[PDB]
Each structure stands twice: as C-alpha cells, then as structure tokens.
Amino acid sequence: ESLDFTDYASRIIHPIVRTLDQSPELRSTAMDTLSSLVFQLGKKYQIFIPMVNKVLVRHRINHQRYDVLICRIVKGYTL
Amino acid sequence: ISATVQTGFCDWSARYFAQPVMKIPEEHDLESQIRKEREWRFLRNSRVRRQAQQVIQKGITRLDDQIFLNRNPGVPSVVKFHPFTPCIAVADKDSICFWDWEKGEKLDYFHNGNPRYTRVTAMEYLNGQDCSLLLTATDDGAIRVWKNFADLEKNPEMVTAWQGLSAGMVVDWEQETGLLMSSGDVRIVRIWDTDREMKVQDIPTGADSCVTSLSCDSHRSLIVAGLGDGSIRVYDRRMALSECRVMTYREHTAWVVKASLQKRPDGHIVSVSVNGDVRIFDPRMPESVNVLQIVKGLTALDIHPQADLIACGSVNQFTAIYNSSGELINNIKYAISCLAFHPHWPHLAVGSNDYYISVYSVE
Amino acid sequence: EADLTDWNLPLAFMKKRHCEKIEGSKSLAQSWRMKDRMKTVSVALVLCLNVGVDPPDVVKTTPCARLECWIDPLSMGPQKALETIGANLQKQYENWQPRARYKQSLDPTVDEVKKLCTSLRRNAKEERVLFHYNGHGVPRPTVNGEVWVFNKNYTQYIPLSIYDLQTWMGSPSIFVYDCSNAGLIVKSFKQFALQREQELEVSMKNCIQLAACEATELLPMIPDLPADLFTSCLTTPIKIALRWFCMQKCVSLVPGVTLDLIEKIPGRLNDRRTPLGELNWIFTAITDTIAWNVLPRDLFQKLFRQDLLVASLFRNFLLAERIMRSYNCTPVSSPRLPPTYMHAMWQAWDLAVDICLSQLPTIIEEGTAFRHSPFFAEQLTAFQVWLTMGVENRNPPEQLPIVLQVLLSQVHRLRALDLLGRFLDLGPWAVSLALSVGIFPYVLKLLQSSARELRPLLVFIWAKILAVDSSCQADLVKDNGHKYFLSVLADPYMPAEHRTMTAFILAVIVNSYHTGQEACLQGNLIAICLEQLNDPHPLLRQWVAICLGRIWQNFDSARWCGVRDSAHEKLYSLLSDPIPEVRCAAVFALGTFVGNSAERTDHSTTIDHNVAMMLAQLVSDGSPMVRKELVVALSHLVVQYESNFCTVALQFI
Amino acid sequence: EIRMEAARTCSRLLTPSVSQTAVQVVADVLSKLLVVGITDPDPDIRYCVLASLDERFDAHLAQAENLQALFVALNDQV
Amino acid sequence: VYTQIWRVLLHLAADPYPEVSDVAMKVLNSIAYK
C-alpha cells in the first residue's frame, strides 16, 4: 500500500506461485497479497500473467478482486 | 448545383505524404514474403521452361490424348494458355469462361460488358511470368484488363480500359518492350505504350483491306501484319513513319486467318489465308521460300513457336496437324474456330462449332 | 539461368494508381485543438502567519521550523517580517505569472477577506482567480468545515465557514491550502459543492483544489526544512529540490557538497546556459514527461495545457508529492492523480542534479567553465533508438515531451527537428500524438527563424502535419508562414524533393480557402510555380500544377494574373507529359481555370475556347484516370455556358 | 527439459539478426524469450535464457519495454 | 465549339471503364433537363 514494489516483482511473485502449490492453507492470504501487488504494478504485471494463470487453473483459484484487476489490465482501463 | 461532382484525385494524391517515405520499400526487401513467393514462382517458371525444353529435344510424338471434354454456355471465340499456371481462359461472345485442365472444373464466369453487336476477338496474358493480367480487346476498339480472374478469395477486377483505334481488332503484346499495337478495320497501326498510357507511334498501314492478323518479333522491330485482300506487309518502327514499310509481297487473295511469326532470329512468316495454302516468307526476301496447300476451305488455324506444328482446322471436323515442311503426323477425327498451343508444353486446344473444349497432350 | 529475364521485365498496370483506388483518405476527428485558453487574472495571498505567536493546537518544538518564504520572521521583528514575507511571496509567484494583480492579506479579518475576494471576483468574473491560504499561525481546521482567522484586535481566532468562503469566490477558481489538517477543507469543500448541487435542482469541475496534507496527517516539524514546505515547493521548486537532495543518503556519492554551496550556486532561473537555469530547464522536461506518461490524455490537456500557471503548479506539485511522501505526508488534489512518486524518470532527475552540482567546487573556487549536462543529448539518443524499431504501434516513447523542450534552444535544435520528422514519417497515428502533446505552436514559431539549415527540416515536418490536419492552413496564413515556404519554392539550390513538399504545403494552404488564395496570389505564387513547371521531377510537376489550379479556384483575380502570365499556354506542354499523374493534374488546373469565368470580357471567352480545343484533344488517352478529370474539367465549361450547351443539345433532338 | 532445450534452440536460430517483418518477428520472439527468462519458475531455465541473450541482441534489448523486464530481473531470487 | 465539346462528352459517355462512363453520364444528363 505504501512502498514501491516494482523492482522486487520476481523476488516475491515466484515464492508466491510456489506457495500456492506447496500449501493450500496460505492460498487465501497469498492471493490477497497477489491482488494488492497487481494493483500496484498495473501494466508491469502483464509479463507474469501467463505463468500465474497456469498456476491458478491447476488448483482452480477464482479470486474476485484478482480476476477484475486482470480483466482491467488486459482491457487497458485505468482505475 | 448538386450535379457538380468532385473527384477524389486531389485528396488521393495527398495520401502520398501520409505514407512513409524514408524507409526501404517492400520490393527491395530480399527476405520479404512477396519476393520469396515471387522467387518461388520464378523457380517454378524456370523449371517449366526447362522441362518443356527437354520434351522438345525428345521430339514430338503423335498427339491424340483427350484430357477432358466439357461444354460451355457460349461459342468459344478465342482461347489462350497461361504460360505457367494451368488457367485456360475460354472466352465467349457475352462471357469469359475460365476453365482448368488438372482439376477439370469451372473456375469463373465474367461478363465482358460489351454490347450484343461487338465480339471479343483477341486476348492476351499480360505479365505472364508473375502477377498475370488478362487483356481483353473488343472488336469495336474497346480494350480492357482483368485481374484476379481465377482466384479463390477474390472477385473479378477490371484494372483499366480505354477505347482503342476509333477482322475486328488484333493485338500483339510485347512484355519486354512494354508496347501494345492495336489494329483492325482502320488503316493505321497504333502503338500504345502502357508505361506512358499514350499512343507513341501511329504507323500508316497503306492498305485498303482490314488488318486481319498482326504478329511481331521480340528484341527487334518486325511488325508483321496480314491483310484481308491477301497481302502481308512488314514494318520497321525504327525508321521514319513514311519509311516504316519495308516489304510488300502479295501471293494470296483471302482473309489471313493467322499470319504468325516465330521467336527465332531466323524469322519465318507462316501465313495461311482462307484458301488454306501455306506460304513461308522471310523478312529479308521478296518472295516465298516454301509453299504448301493443305485444306481447300480453311476456317481457323494455330501454330506453336517451340514446335513447328501448323494446327489446321476443317469444315468436316478434321484437325490436320502438319509440320512446316509439310509432313503428315495426325488427322484427328472428332467450324473449328479456335485452336491454341501452350507457349511451353506441346498441349493443343481445339474448339469446334459445338461449345466443347478439349486439351490434348503428348503422352 | 532463366531468372534474370524474369526480374528484368516491366510489370504493366501495376502501380499505385492501378492497385489502390483513387480515393481520399477519411480525415479523423482532430481533437488536439485546445477548447479555450484560461488566464489567471489575479491572485489572493491570504497569510495567517501570526508572526511572534504560536498556535495553541500544536505545541511547537524549541527549534521547530522557522523559515517562512525563505525569511526568518524572528530576525526582522514581528510587523516588518510579516510585510516582508508578503512581498517576497509576491515576487516568487511573479516568477511563474508576472502579469497578474496581486493583493496580499496579512492576518486578515472576515470582512477584509470578504471585500478582498468580492473585489477580485468583480475584476475577473469569467476568469480563474487563485486563493492561497497559509494557516501555519492559526489552529487546525475543524471537522465542521471551518477555517480560522483573527479579530480586529488579534485577541481571538475567528472561524470562517468554507461555504461562505466559496460563496464569495466564483466558479472558475483554484484553491491552495497549506495547513495541517488540509484534507478536512477539501472534503468539506466537496460537501458544500454537492450541497449546492442539491439546492440547485429545487461549481465543482471548475474548482481545482491542492492541499499540503491529508486530514489526519500533520505537517513536519523538522528544523532542517522550512516551515513553508508546501508553498516553497509550488513556488520555488529548484531551491528546495537541491536542499532536499543534500539531505538524502545519496550525498555520500558527492562528498564536499554542503548546503552552503547550494546557497552560492551561480546563475539565474532564466538563463538556460547557466548552471541554475540548466536544472530549471531539465526539471520542466522531467515533470512534463512524468505527467504525460502517467495521466490520461484528457486530464493532461486539462491541467498541463490549458493555462500556464496551473500547469506550472501541477508540475511543481509532482515534486511536492515526492518530497513530502518522505516525511509521512501525502499531498491532495481535487482531480485525483495516480501516484507518480515511484516513476522511473525521478531517478533521472537525481543523476542530472548530481552531475550538475558535482562541478560546483570547481565552478566557485577554481572558476571552471560550467560544462552543460548530457541529459538532453542522451534523451534524444534514446528517442533515436526507439525510432529504429518503432514501426509497430507499441507504447509511445516516454521522451516525446522532452523532444518538445529541446526545440526551444538552438544547441540541439537541428538534431531534434530531424528526429521529429523521422517520427512523423512512421505514420498518421504518430502525427496525431505529436499534435496532442502540443508541438504545433512551437513548430509554427520556428517559421520565424532565418537559419537556412532549418528550411529542409521544417518543410518536411509541415508536409506531414498538413497531410493529416488540413485545418492548420488557417494558422499558417495568420502568422505569415506562407512566406517562409515561398522562399523555399524559389530556391534553385534546394533539392527538388523538398521543393515538392513545399508545393504540397502551399497547395493545402490555398485549398478551398479564399483568405489563403488571396494571400498567396499577392505573394506571386503563379509566377513562381511556372518557373518550376518544367522541372526534371514528375512529383513536382504534378503538384505545382494542382497548386496552380487551386489558386484560381473561384478566384478571378488569380485567373487574371494567370492570363497575364499566360499560364494556360504553358500548361499545354504538360498535356503531353509521359507521367499520367502530371497529365491529370494538368487537366485539373486547366478545368479550374475555365470554371471561374464569372462573365468577364470577351477575351475570356476566346481563351476558354482555346483551352477547350486543347483539352478536346485529350480524348484518345490510355488512362481513364485522366479521362475522368477530363469530364470534371469539361463540367466547369458546361456550368459556365449552360445556356449555350442547351442550344446544342436541343438541336440534335 | 523441452522448455530448456527449445529455449537454447530459438536463441541459437536467431543468429541471423533491413526488413520490417523480420524485426517484428525477432521482437515478438525476443519478447516471449524475455518473459520466459523473467517468469519461468525453474531458475535453471531462467538462467539459460538470460545467458543466451548475448551481444547480438543488444540492439533489441535496449528498447524501453525490454529494459523494463530486465530491471525486474535484477531482483531475481537466484 | 460547343458542338465539338458535346461530341467529346459523347465519347466519355460511352467509355469502356464504368466509373468514367457513369460520371460522364451524370454530367451529360444534368444538361438535358435544363
């Protein structure tokens, strides 16, 4: 919410994706962290979208806020 | 005031500056897909030239094979073979049927647009080597050019059209020179340059009768022009218009069905009138070298430059295919008003009064 | 092999006129034009400094923050200091907007504020008025939407309702609040805005608001920074930007750079060749770049293009947002901006500062010549690298507003004009972008230059622009830029490629525009055009002929000049031109010449019959494109003699 | 093993690296490659891809979009 | 002179190309009804 996290996108996103496999309990918290990060990255998150989508389908992760944010990013609307 | 129309010419011209300029054009790109497909077509062309040249060295065998027999709605007036792509345009008085001789299917059907009195006499294939077009000169004078004539995803498209002149009309395309020489009932042989879209030279024929046929020589100026009275003039366009006429030998009295010239440096004008007698002339001689008499009542004739077969016709359904020396090869038993050889393969089309199109082949 | 024969063959009837249709491209809705130009006519400086007194709400630390408008109030004594700060503050604002009526209010009453605001509203009823509020000396604003002022005796803090404060000020206005809980004012302002909108059934978008802090946040108490931290940022950005740079951890990278060297930095804020003016110029580019990349195009032109002073305030607001963020402070704006503090361009600003004031020890002490920054050079290098692979419609280049800033000097003007042309070449989408960023009034100002090296570059740039937006013909006549091009068209040494573009530019200015036809006629275009009518370039011959045809389009004066010069006679040569574009252009001009006879003397009729028979010998022509214009040309002849052609038509019936 | 080899293959087959179509193709492939080099979970594949982006490609890597990817890569776990 | 230019427009009216014949016919018909 307060700091800039663009620099450290890989250092976080890759452990998160890995956390969403190895443990289903953290899946909720981690997805909430991911959506917030996505909101902060914006168009810079476009790179990671293919890989994360792959991990979501593997465990049917259907987050409301995240799907909205991706939809907005692909559309290009800013809010 | 609403009748005042304004062309989009001044606006279309301004589009030149919207497009980029500094960058390399698409044609200069050696690795572009259009150039690769063009180089692939030229690779296919050089193969078809080589393979056809190899068949000529093996001689010409008897030709009796019928690849197909279809029927058109109209009478076949003029036939041409596309040099490389198998597209055999068989035009009619009020249409241009585009047939094929590998699938064996009707590919397209145009309407030329000309009135009922007029008739499409002559036809050519412009830019036959690649991105070919179809010139369609009408007998009254109208010339017009058609693109995308046997395509899957495309329709008829008339590129350009302009009233020429003003027998019917005769044409001799010269791909390398870029010129086009309309002629017919008039006493003039115009030379329309297609790069400048203007008539360059208007050579006077010097003959009362109509110019029934007209054939020229590549890499030289040797405009041969048969005439309805019988004579066969030859003109050189390099000299002055008054001096353009070189020879005027007359040894016939009938319409010249097809005064055809060979592409060799040893040019031989094989002229066959309605009488049906061949007289092989030369451009450098005043009289005929060889003489032949084939059919009494000739109706239409065709020749091939690569193979010297004088494909004759007959009222009694015969198709005499003799040599220039006059030897008998075949007499294929079925107004045969259209025969047409390929520029490369020894294929011979035939077309009787009945609207039936064939395509023969030498095994 | 049999391939050299194939490649060396003319492809007949395969050219632009054949493949593409002869049709004009539909002009897009050019929205780049500014709707209106605002002018900040007057400024209200409400200063509640309360010098010599401390507000009860905030228990100030013993050092606290003393500097106000870069003036220690306790040094000068209470009354003089308050007058001095008001004077300096006016000067500071006069750096950005020197032509505005300033009226200070120093610890004002309520009536005093009422009479002040109502007078400034009377002066500029329809124009923006700035309201500056500095509440460092009064208690923090209340939740009920109130702001504190004094009583006549300065014995009681009187509250002032934001509703009443926004009553006296009008619709077009901008509000700057520099106080502790400044968010409360902005919230309550929008409330009273909504409350007024509810009352209107049975002034929101117009009113802009900037606030130093969020309602919860407090202003920093740090002795190093000035107390007037927000106002200083808005009004002296470079000054605090260097002082803040010297407070960060990044000073270790430049040892021997204290605040004392920053005080004694040489130069001024105007002279861009000095060290101080260099930074100000760089800063203006960087801030305008961040804004264009982050904000949506609509809101950018609203704030950064409408009027200069607002654009300057928001430019400096972005710097305030960055600095105050580092002290748990968040500035607030009424049109909410997305956070720009972490933009990449900010890193470039640090390096630019670092290199600029690493030389200061040698400039002050050794007296070394200040070498200019490579910043603008390197930014053009980045734009050039982008152009190499810029064919695709990818994200636009960040540096586009920097290219604009580079055009203002001469040092890099040649390189920028080149690159800008290459960019416009890419396509009409790019020309639209360059018009939206606001290149037009600067490219037009360069037409006042006399540097002949610029002539080929400006001709190119203007041809691309006028190809898209033909309405700019209005502007070129106003500024007498058509004379600049006339000179290029009468220069034999100028290549025929650039002279061709020049003839097109003139053919657009003249196109269906009587003011431009009358202006180019007086500039002797027809005589100049005929001098170039027999050039060895088929593009020039075509357009020069269209240009000639357009100038006498429904304008008999240009026809008479053509009759004196005898142009119609010289045009018959083009009727036998090889290139059918030229023949067509020739038919166009000869047709437009006939069409505007307007029942002149008999001479005209004999000339029209001479032009008729010369056109009547273009029937047997190969190109139908020419034959089509031949009809349109003979249409003009029929329209002129409609009564005569009716006699011929009725005869053969 | 397929991803790791297909990466080595494409990076080798782009040694022929003016035609706009080829540039747009190289730009597309190299954008996909950079995405794999940033986003692939298996850090061996990410290392191979990054190592394969040699001097040859530096004309393309210097583009803004490609440089924004590379910056993220300076904060890799490995 | 007008006889000659009307005969010219007759040639453009009977043009092989459709676009030229169409535009020539419009302009030629806009005379007839006057």
Q: What is the DSSP string of D33-55?
A: HHHHHHH-S-HHHHHHHHHH--G
Asked if A78 and C296 come within 8 Å (Cβ–Cβ), the reply is yes
Smallest Cα distance from D62 to chain B, Å = 21
Q: In the beta sheet, which residues pair with residue B248?
A: B233
A and B touch per CB criterion (3+ pairs under 8 A): no
Q: In the beta sheet, which residues pair with residue B256?
A: B273
Asked if B13 and C581 come within 8 Å (Cβ–Cβ), the reply is yes
Positive or negative CA dihedral for D4, D6, D7, D11? Answer: positive
C470 CB-near residues (< 8 Å, 6+ apart): C27, C508, C511
Asked if D65 and C394 come within 8 Å (Cβ–Cβ), the reply is yes
Q: Which residue of C has its CA nearest to E7?
A: C616
Asked if B8 and C12 come within 8 Å (Cβ–Cβ), the reply is no
- Give the separation between CA B10 and CA C629, rounded to whole angstroms: 10
Q: Which two tokens stand for residue B89?
A: 């345009």
| Strand pairing report for C173-178 and C207-211 | parallel
Q: Read off the amino acid at residue C226.
A: P
C-alpha separations of C431 from B19, C467, C501 in Å: 12, 10, 16
- Give the separation between CA C613 and CA B307, rounded to whole angstroms: 53
Please tell me the total number of residues recorded for chain D in this structure.
78
* CB < 8 Å to B32, chain D: 19, 21
Exposed/middle/buried for residue C370 (C-beta within 10 Å: 0-12, 13-18, 19+): middle
Report the SS3 class of residue C304: helix
Three state DSSP letters for chain B: CCCCCCCCHHHHHHHHHHCCCCCCCCCCCCCCHHHHHHHHHHHHHHHHHHHHHHHHHCCCCCCCEEEEEEECCCCCCEEEECCCCCCEEEECCCCEEEECCCCCCEEEEECCCCCCCCCEEEEEEECCCCCCEEEEEECCCEEEEEECCCCCCCCCEEEEEEECCCCCEECCEECCCCEECCEECCCEEEEEECCCCEEEEEEECCCCCCCCEEECCCCCCCEEEECCCCCEEEECCCCCCCCCEEEEECCCCCCECCCECCCCCCCCEEEEECCCEEEEECCCCCCCCEEEECCCCCCCCECCCCCCEEECCCCCCCCEEEECCCCCCEECCCCCCEEEECCCCCCEEEECCCCEEEEEECC
- Least CB-CB distance to E26: which of B3, B113, B142? B3
Query: Are C229 and C209 within 8 A, CB to CB?
Result: no
Residue that the structure tokens 């043009």 belong to: E15
- Give the separation between CA B346 and CA B56, rounded to whole angstroms: 8
DSSP C209: E
Query: Are D37 and D49 within 8 A, CB to CB?
Result: yes
Q: Which two tokens stand for residue C385?
A: 């690298």
Q: Which residue of E has its CA nearest to C645?
A: E2
Asked if E27 and C631 come within 8 Å (Cβ–Cβ), the reply is yes
- Least CB-CB distance to E5: which of C616, C632, C647? C616
- Least CB-CB distance to B14: which of C467, C625, C635? C467
* CB < 8 Å to A11, chain D: 75-77
- Give the separation between CA B343 and CA B79, rounded to whole angstroms: 13
- Taking alpha carbons only, the member of C239, C263, C400, C245 closest to residue C323 is C245
Asked if D19 and B31 come within 8 Å (Cβ–Cβ), the reply is yes
Q: Which residue of C has its CA nearest to E4?
A: C616
Asked if D18 and B24 come within 8 Å (Cβ–Cβ), the reply is yes
Please tell me the total number of residues recorded for chain B in this structure.
363
Specify whether the backbone of C107 is left (phi greater than 0), alpha (psi in -120 to 50) or beta: left
Q: Which two tokens stand for residue C489?
A: 């068209």
Query: Are B324 and B268 within 8 A, CB to CB?
Result: yes
Smallest Cα distance from D74 to chain A, Å = 8
Query: Are C381 and C355 within 8 A, CB to CB?
Result: no
Report the SS3 class of residue C208: strand
Asked if A4 and C342 come within 8 Å (Cβ–Cβ), the reply is yes
C-alpha separations of A4 from A41, B143, C579 in Å: 9, 72, 63
- Give the separation between CA B168 and CA B293, rounded to whole angstroms: 27
C482 CB-near residues (< 8 Å, 6+ apart): C476, C506, C509, C516, C519, C520, C523
How many Cβ contacts (< 8 angstroms) between chains A and C? 5
Query: Are C271 and C277 within 8 A, CB to CB?
Result: yes
- Least CB-CB distance to C624: which of B13, B160, B178? B160
C-alpha torsion angle, residues C226, C232, C236, C241 (rounded to 10): 60
- Taking alpha carbons only, the member of C570, C568, C576 closest to residue C604 is C568
Positive or negative CA dihedral for C328, C334, C336, C342? Answer: negative
Smallest Cα distance from D21 to chain C, Å = 10
Residue that the structure tokens 């005969």 belong to: E7
Query: Are B8 and E31 within 8 A, CB to CB?
Result: no
C-alpha torsion angle, residues B216, B218, B221, B225 (rounded to 10): 0
Sheet holding B213-215, edge to edge: B213-215, B223-226, B232-235, B245-249
- Give the separation between CA C557 and CA C549, rounded to whole angstroms: 13
Buried/exposed code over C53-73 (b: 16+ C-beta within 10 A; e: otherwise): eebeeeeeeeeebebbbebeb
C-alpha separations of C432 from C386, C424, C505, D28 in Å: 18, 9, 18, 26
First and final C-alpha spacing in chain C? 66
Query: Rounded to an integer, what is the distance from CA B361 to the centroid of its chain?
Result: 20
Three state DSSP letters for C314-325: HHHHHHHHHHHH
Report the SS3 class of residue C641: coil
Query: Are C615 and C590 within 8 A, CB to CB?
Result: yes
B63 CB-near residues (< 8 Å, 6+ apart): B321, B330, B332, B346, B348, B360, B361, B362
Inform me whether the C-beta atom of residue D2 falls under 8 Å from chain A C-beta atoms. Answer: no
Query: Rounded to an integer, what is the distance from CA C259 to the centroid of its chain?
Result: 36
Which element (helix H / strand E) includes C581?
helix C580-595
DSSP C326: T
- Give the separation between CA C552 and CA C560, rounded to whole angstroms: 9
Asked if E26 and B5 come within 8 Å (Cβ–Cβ), the reply is yes
DSSP C211: E
- Give the separation between CA C60 and CA C180, rounded to whole angstroms: 13
Instruction: Please calculate the CA angle B131-B133-B137 and round it to the nearest 5 degrees.
Output: 170
| Strand pairing report for B179-180 and B96-99 | unpaired
Nearest 5°: phi and psi at B90? -120, 95
C-alpha separations of B64 from B331, B362, C391, C507 in Å: 9, 7, 59, 67
Query: Are B300 and B272 within 8 A, CB to CB?
Result: no
C-alpha separations of B18 from B12, C460, C467, C588 in Å: 10, 12, 6, 22
Query: Are C380 and C403 within 8 A, CB to CB?
Result: yes
Q: Which residue of D has its CA nearest to A53?
A: D39
Asked if B162 and E26 come within 8 Å (Cβ–Cβ), the reply is no
Query: Are B158 and B146 within 8 A, CB to CB?
Result: yes
Q: Read off the amino acid at residue B334.
A: Y
| Strand pairing report for B183-184 and B169-170 | antiparallel
Asked if A4 and C338 come within 8 Å (Cβ–Cβ), the reply is no
Asked if D63 and C385 come within 8 Å (Cβ–Cβ), the reply is yes
Q: Which two tokens stand for residue B20?
A: 């980029």
Residue that the structure tokens 């009542």 belong to: B297
Nearest 5°: phi and psi at B184? 180, -125
Q: Which of C1, C3, C4, C6 to mutate to test the interface with B (most CBs of B within 10 A)?
A: C6
- Give the separation between CA C52 and CA C69, rounded to whole angstroms: 16
CB atoms within 10 A of CB C340: 18
Query: Are B13 and C546 within 8 A, CB to CB?
Result: yes
Inform me whether the C-beta atom of residue D6 falls under 8 Å from chain C C-beta atoms. Answer: no
Q: Which two tokens stand for residue B330?
A: 């075949």
Q: What would the DSSP string read from start to end of A28-54?
A: HHHHHHHHHHHHHHGGGGGGGHHHHHH
Q: Which two tokens stand for residue C490?
A: 């009468």
CB atoms within 10 A of CB E34: 11
- Give the separation between CA D49 and CA D53, rounded to whole angstroms: 7
Q: Read off the amino acid at residue A22.
A: Q
* CB < 8 Å to E15, chain B: 161, 163
* CB < 8 Å to D21, chain B: 29, 31-33
* CB < 8 Å to B31, chain D: 19, 21-22
Query: Are B126 and B133 within 8 A, CB to CB?
Result: yes
Nearest 5°: phi and psi at C541? -55, -40
Query: Are C288 and C315 within 8 A, CB to CB?
Result: yes
* CB < 8 Å to C392, chain D: 24, 27
Q: Read off the amino acid at residue C299.
A: L
Smallest Cα distance from B198 to chain C, Å = 6
Q: In the beta sheet, which residues pair with residue B204?
A: B188
Three state DSSP letters for C144-201: CCEEEEECCCCCCEEEEEHHHHHHHCCCCEEEEEECCCHHHHHHHHHHHHHHHHHHHH
Nearest 5°: phi and psi at C24? -75, 145
Inform me whether the C-beta atom of residue C385 falls under 8 Å from chain D C-beta atoms. Answer: yes
Asked if D20 and B33 come within 8 Å (Cβ–Cβ), the reply is no
> What was the resolution (in A) of this experimentally determined structure?
4.1
| Strand pairing report for B78-81 and B88-91 | antiparallel
B133 CB-near residues (< 8 Å, 6+ apart): B125, B126, B127, B145, B146, B147, B159, C12, C13
Inform me whether the C-beta atom of residue C157 falls under 8 Å from chain A C-beta atoms. Answer: no
First and final C-alpha spacing in chain D? 20
Asked if E5 and C634 come within 8 Å (Cβ–Cβ), the reply is yes
Report the SS3 class of residue C311: helix
Q: Which of B29, B33, B34, B36 to mutate to test the interface with D (most CBs of D within 10 A)?
A: B29
CB atoms within 10 A of CB B58: 8
- Give the separation between CA C392 and CA D20, rounded to whole angstroms: 9
B and C touch per CB criterion (3+ pairs under 8 A): yes
* CB < 8 Å to B24, chain D: 18-19
- Give the separation between CA C8 and CA B44, rounded to whole angstroms: 17
Report the SS3 class of residue C327: coil
Task: Give CB contacts under 8 A, 24+ apart, made by C438-442.
Answer: C438/C32, C438/C301, C438/C305, C438/C404, C439/C404, C439/C407, C440/C32, C440/C465, C440/C472, C440/C475, C442/C404, C442/C407, C442/C408
- Give the separation between CA C456 and CA C446, rounded to whole angstroms: 12
Q: Which B residues in the span 22-41 are in contact with D, Cβ-Cβ below 8 Å?
A: 23-24, 29-33
The rounded radius of gyration (Å) of the Cα atoms in chain C is 33
Query: Are B133 and B161 within 8 A, CB to CB?
Result: no
Q: Which residue of E has its CA nearest to B143?
A: E16
CB atoms within 10 A of CB C412: 18
Q: Which two tokens stand for residue D16?
A: 């022929």
Residue that the structure tokens 């400044």 belong to: C182
C-alpha separations of C348 from C236, C283, C376, C379, D65 in Å: 20, 10, 11, 10, 17
Q: Read off the amino acid at residue C112.
A: E
Q: Which two tokens stand for residue D4?
A: 């790791």
Report the SS3 class of residue C132: strand
User: Experimental technique used?
Assistant: cryo-EM
Q: Read off the amino acid at residue B248.
A: T
Asked if B14 and C504 come within 8 Å (Cβ–Cβ), the reply is yes
Exposed/middle/buried for residue C142 (C-beta within 10 Å: 0-12, 13-18, 19+): middle
* CB < 8 Å to D75, chain A: 7-11
- Taking alpha carbons only, the member of B227, B219, B226, B303 closest to residue B264 is B219
Angle of helix B9-18 relative to helix C496-509, nearest 10 degrees, comes to 130
Q: Which two tokens stand for residue B79?
A: 């036939």
- Taking alpha carbons only, the member of B315, B362, B359 closest to residue B102 is B359
C606 CB-near residues (< 8 Å, 6+ apart): none
First and final C-alpha spacing in chain B? 69
Q: Read off the amino acid at residue C7.
A: W
Q: Which residue of B has its CA nearest to D16?
A: B31
C-alpha separations of A13 from A36, A37, D71 in Å: 12, 9, 15
C205 CB-near residues (< 8 Å, 6+ apart): none
C interface residues, E as partner, C-beta within 8 Å: 609, 612-613, 616, 619, 624, 627-628, 630-632, 634-635, 637-638, 641-642, 644-649
- Give the separation between CA B38 and CA B32, rounded to whole angstroms: 10
Positive or negative CA dihedral for C430, C433, C435, C438? Answer: negative
Smallest Cα distance from A58 to chain C, Å = 32
Asked if C398 and D59 come within 8 Å (Cβ–Cβ), the reply is no
Q: Which two tokens stand for residue B337?
A: 């008003």
- Taking alpha carbons only, the member of C23, C213, D5 closest to residue B11 is C23
- Give the separation between CA B200 and CA A67, rounded to whole angstroms: 71
- Give the separation between CA C46 and CA C48, rounded to whole angstroms: 7
Q: Which two tokens stand for residue B202?
A: 């208007």
C-alpha torsion angle, residues B212, B218, B219, B223 (rounded to 10): 0
D: neighbours with 3+ CB pairs under 8 Å?
A: A, B, C
* CB < 8 Å to C395, chain D: 64-65
Q: What would the DSSP string read from start to end of chain D?
A: -HHHHHHHHHHHHT-----HHHHHHHHHHHHHHHHHHHH-S-HHHHHHHHHH--GGGHHHHTSHHHHHHHHHHTT---
Smallest Cα distance from C139 to chain A, Å = 29
